[PDB]
Design a protein around this ligand. Sequence first.
Ligand SMILES: OC[C@H]1O[C@@H](O[C@@H]2[C@@H](O)[C@H](O[C@@H]3[C@@H](O)[C@H](O[C@@H]4[C@@H](O)[C@H](O[C@@H]5[C@@H](O)[C@H](O)O[C@H](CO)[C@H]5O)O[C@H](CO)[C@H]4O)O[C@H](CO)[C@H]3O)O[C@H](CO)[C@H]2O)[C@H](O)[C@@H](O)[C@@H]1O
Ligand SMILES: OC[C@H]1O[C@@H](O[C@@H]2[C@@H](O)[C@H](O[C@@H]3[C@@H](O)[C@H](O[C@@H]4[C@@H](O)[C@H](O[C@@H]5[C@@H](O)[C@H](O)O[C@H](CO)[C@H]5O)O[C@H](CO)[C@H]4O)O[C@H](CO)[C@H]3O)O[C@H](CO)[C@H]2O)[C@H](O)[C@@H](O)[C@@H]1O
Length: 752
Amino acid sequence: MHAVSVGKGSYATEFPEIDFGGINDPGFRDQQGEPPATIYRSDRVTGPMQTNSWWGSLAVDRFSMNQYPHPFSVRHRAEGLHVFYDAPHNMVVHENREAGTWHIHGAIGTDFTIKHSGTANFEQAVVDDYNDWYVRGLLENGAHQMAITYGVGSPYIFVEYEDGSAVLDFDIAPDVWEMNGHVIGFSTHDHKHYAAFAPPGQNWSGIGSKTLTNNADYIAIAKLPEKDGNMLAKFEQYAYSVVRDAVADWTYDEATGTVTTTFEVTTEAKVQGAPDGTIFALYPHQYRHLASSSENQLLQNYQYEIIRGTMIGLEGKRFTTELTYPGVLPSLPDLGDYDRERLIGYLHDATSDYPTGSDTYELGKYIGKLATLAPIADQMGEYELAEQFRGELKDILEDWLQATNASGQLKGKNLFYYNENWGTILGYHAAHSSATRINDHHFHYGYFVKAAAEIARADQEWAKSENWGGMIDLLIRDFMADRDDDLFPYLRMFDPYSGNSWADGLATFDAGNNQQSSSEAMHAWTNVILWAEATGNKALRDRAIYLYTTEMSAINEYFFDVHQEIFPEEYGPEIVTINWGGKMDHATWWNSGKVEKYAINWLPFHGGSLYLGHHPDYVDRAYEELRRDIGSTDWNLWSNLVWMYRAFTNPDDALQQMEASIDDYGLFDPGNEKIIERGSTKAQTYHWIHNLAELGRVDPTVTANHPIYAVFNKNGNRTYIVYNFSDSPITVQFSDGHSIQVEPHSFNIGNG
Ligand SMILES: OC[C@H]1O[C@@H](O[C@@H]2[C@@H](O)[C@H](O[C@@H]3[C@@H](O)[C@H](O[C@@H]4[C@@H](O)[C@H](O[C@@H]5[C@@H](O)[C@H](O)O[C@H](CO)[C@H]5O)O[C@H](CO)[C@H]4O)O[C@H](CO)[C@H]3O)O[C@H](CO)[C@H]2O)[C@H](O)[C@@H](O)[C@@H]1O
Ligand SMILES: OC[C@H]1O[C@@H](O[C@@H]2[C@@H](O)[C@H](O[C@@H]3[C@@H](O)[C@H](O[C@@H]4[C@@H](O)[C@H](O[C@@H]5[C@@H](O)[C@H](O)O[C@H](CO)[C@H]5O)O[C@H](CO)[C@H]4O)O[C@H](CO)[C@H]3O)O[C@H](CO)[C@H]2O)[C@H](O)[C@@H](O)[C@@H]1O
């Protein structure tokens, strides 16, 4: 009737009567709701609706908000599609010293509007089709329709008309510098170079005026890299090849660690003989990892400047990138030079900790904390305490993973519900608009997966599908489904072309979509790798490896700019806290101080956090910048996270800071995160820093032929760590020739 059983658990299929717990706060109450009833999609778009996309505002707003199909910005309006390009004169870098914020952004302008000869009063714009990274938007007014196909990484906008023809409208007359009849090269008054393409024989009119017109029912617009007729000619070759399908297909080669992704379009010809291909604009995270076999397709001098640095052109049907998956661990092992009794004391202190709210996020942070403590308790010989922590995880998960109470009725809180309208699992109590905007399902549910993975590491029976595994697998499907999932859209959170996850379900902002904590995304991917390995689910594991590895490539470019190529020279900080489609901010979604605008991209610390140490010069540069701004090592908040980060390159410094301040205050206090951030513990902090002191630096130059491992290097001496989730012993080969044997359900070293 009102819930569906899944193993021992269930999810609600009717919206529950929420138990507000007597809380009257309207913000809290408004969070316990559902996403919008109205979805702006045509009847060609059926099944679970895609969310968390760069283009999402088209589906939620009657028209759209401003979007960033780089290299363009566009927005839908009743009058037509506005097109813009941020030139250098449009870009700014601003600091608000009092707020401690910085902002890199452009403008919300209009270079021209793509219009329909029959109407400038469209009723709405709907999603009419989409694929892995393009969308087809359909402006509708009865018989008058204008379908616009565009995408991130497409320097084309394809325009198809019904019951009318093409118009390009400008506020100031453009310079048409090349007039080939059906093809024109033009510039805005402020020298932005574009081109427009119609079928042969359909000639452009209005040249020299503010309005360029064409009788064709098909045109394409291109952003040109330069005012160059040879480039115009190249763009003409693919201007009639409209992208209909676009897939990012991947493989993981376990032996080598290589994740290979092939981006492939399928086009429809708008003139006879049009080739099956396009011109792609690649982002830095792509072209820096371009496969050898794709290099011949590069259009070398075809560059575009955007918020994310320089894009480059590449022609054809497909291209391929190659990345290296570095491994993850379930925990750091027991290899530190800590006082073990001191660590035991901290493990017991952590029983005083409790969740600071009833919503999925705060509960998530608490269950991640317990799951992090349990392996450390095992290591220290506090085996009943470890069991206490895992028992508490079981109690919490077995509660949340059941939608019905003892009577068989729906619960009012601590449950999951399937919103059928969009096709998404929502958890109540909700927060951060996880339900009302379909936000942050990776951030929140990643913590539930961590809890499950720690349980599964000790208890395979609990994790079976028919027990509690089916419900965990349902949560994972919500945020990272494979194709043809009957309940959920494909890879909800992830944008395979932009290379990152997008946190906002709706994307109804004029900067496009955003992501703040890239580290909470990486945490989700880590935990699925661990869960899938524990439960023997190779396909799921490999999908999470692809996500972890790809997201890592985007983080190092756009959040960290490890290569010192992307952020403008005048931008002071050494991190971007929030990446948007259209802008970059050193700022947080809540009111914070200096440390948090860095550390929200570090936390939480866990066995998959070692990607943060791959670039020791970056780690040093970022730490030194934050230290400069603070003016000392008196961290304003979350001191433990700064010490843990510092330990990637200078564990002696990290240790002395920790010794000086870690016991400044006593047991868990929600009002005071000066020393210990509320998702962290003293025990975790002390264990982490001492392990890094013994291990040295992360060594990303060595891979292995199994996925659960790490390699460190201290002055040329390597330490190899492997965790084996199997009932059988394994042998692991490392790429430097080293081999080890690992016993069932253990680390090779430091089991403790
Ligand atoms: O130390 C005491 C203080 O601790 C703070 O908790 C921190 C916590 O807020 C932080 O959360 C992260 C979230 O920012 C992030 O979630 C984002 C949403 O918050 C955001 O919502 C916006 C909304 O702010 C705005 O008003 O309206 C928008 C719609 O118009 C709406 O979208 O949306 C983002 C996506 O667009 C979304 O990602 O993600 C995670 C939570 O889901 C968190 O990473 O996390 C910190 C670290 O755990 C916390 O310390 C409290 O907030 C303060 O009140 C306390 O005083
Ligand atoms: O200082 C003490 C108080 O601090 C507060 O925290 C501050 C925090 O709220 C602030 O969050 C920033 C967001 O406000 C910002 O959101 C922007 C959107 O508002 C904007 O929306 C527009 C919409 O206004 C317009 O009508 O329609 C447009 C669509 O057509 C729509 O886009 O969208 C922007 C993106 O397009 C969006 O950025 O987003 C920032 C990140 O980019 C947030 O940082 O941040 C401050 C700095 O960290 C915080 O100080 C607390 O909440 C208070 O309780 C304290 O009293």
